[PDB]
Swiss-Prot record:
<dbReference type="GO" id="GO:0000974">
    <property type="term" value="C:Prp19 complex"/>
</dbReference>
<feature type="modified residue" description="Phosphoserine">
    <location>
        <position position="16"/>
    </location>
</feature>
<comment type="similarity">
    <text>Belongs to the WD repeat PRL1/PRL2 family.</text>
</comment>
<protein>
    <recommendedName>
        <fullName>Pleiotropic regulator 1</fullName>
    </recommendedName>
</protein>
<dbReference type="GO" id="GO:0000398">
    <property type="term" value="P:mRNA splicing, via spliceosome"/>
</dbReference>
<dbReference type="GO" id="GO:0005634">
    <property type="term" value="C:nucleus"/>
</dbReference>
<dbReference type="GO" id="GO:0034504">
    <property type="term" value="P:protein localization to nucleus"/>
</dbReference>
<feature type="modified residue" description="Phosphoserine">
    <location>
        <position position="206"/>
    </location>
</feature>
<keyword id="KW-0747">Spliceosome</keyword>
<keyword id="KW-0007">Acetylation</keyword>
<feature type="repeat" description="WD 7">
    <location>
        <begin position="276"/>
        <end position="315"/>
    </location>
</feature>
<feature type="repeat" description="WD 4">
    <location>
        <begin position="143"/>
        <end position="182"/>
    </location>
</feature>
<dbReference type="GO" id="GO:0071013">
    <property type="term" value="C:catalytic step 2 spliceosome"/>
</dbReference>
<dbReference type="GO" id="GO:0005654">
    <property type="term" value="C:nucleoplasm"/>
</dbReference>
<keyword id="KW-0853">WD repeat</keyword>
<keyword id="KW-0539">Nucleus</keyword>
<keyword id="KW-0508">mRNA splicing</keyword>
Amino acid sequence: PKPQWHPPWKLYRVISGHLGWVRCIAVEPGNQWFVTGSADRTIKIWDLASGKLKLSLTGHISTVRGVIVSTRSPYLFSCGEDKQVKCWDLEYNKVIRHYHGHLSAVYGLDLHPTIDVLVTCSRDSTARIWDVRTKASVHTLSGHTNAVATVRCQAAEPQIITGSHDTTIRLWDLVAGKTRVTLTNHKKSVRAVVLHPRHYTFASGSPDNIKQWKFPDGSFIQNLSGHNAIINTLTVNSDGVLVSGADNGTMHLWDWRTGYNFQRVHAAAVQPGSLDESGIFACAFDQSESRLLTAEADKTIKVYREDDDTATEET
RNA sequence: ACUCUGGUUUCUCUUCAGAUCGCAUAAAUCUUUCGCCUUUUACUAAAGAUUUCCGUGGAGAGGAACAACUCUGAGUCUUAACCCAAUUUUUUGAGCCUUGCCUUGGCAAGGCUA
């Protein structure tokens, strides 16, 4: 019945100036600074508090495909097209340590909320689990026929998952040095993954359809449908809305507990004359969900806020 | 002056040493700056953080070798020649009477002495 009065989401600010398409995005836990991985081979750091930037990081051999912010230490985990995934120490204005064992480019990375480990989605299809602070590794995650698109993990029951290009979303149980289950729900390769604040159901998406699965035991949740396009990313916020970024430039906001999405957002972020098909590669919800960082292939990061209006239509 | 207490070198194991410098203390890795450079290992020389070698120090525990050598804190740690006490204690002077209070017993006060 579309309950809980889904509020409309609108724009906040526009940002540009990057030398290449923005592959990844991340934010500080205290909303002090922001960072984005880009196609320009240099790790981008943008402080968005006033609309400003943060710092220009260099030394990545290729475009950074992912980054993470460690809660315990000021070390941002780095992952890029150079197959070298290196957590960076920012305390000295220089890196922490460079992880090894990835046979090909790392498509993703993640950090465990409790134990210290490094997760990676490696285009070799290998999802790297690493005991990290010791310079150690942990275990290698295999079984995906194609490359791993995404990676997610949690300190709860062995929820581990790696989105795979093979159309079967992978589920790993890491605790035993093992796996969890094979998810056949997605009919095509799933390029989207999300973790809802409800924490009950793991979220995922694919260009064919979006697959939400209620876990731990192998249960599912719901099949999100109605957005047909290549799905670049899926991000679930605390208000109950999950924005879905696409390579075509259509970001569809999601009402979830209502069973269907909260918006269909079609907007043109296109930069100056070079445009082509470039869409929004990634997006991030803020801590208070007052704005949404928009990272697009046009090298434009646009935060999104709302005008505080009544609206609340239905269909 | 009596008695109970009762010691030195070496070899291992387990902890601690972001230490007043572990006195004349070596080497490696990475983020960069630089040197020369035809690519690499080596390599020129500065910063920072990550470390290993030769060491080395403190505490506790387990051994042997001369150990019967000596230390130890205390415990009541029992001695006669000769000259001396006018500010501290063994050569050093107190008592009586009267009144009031207290159940008396007793206490307080004043006076008397030679």
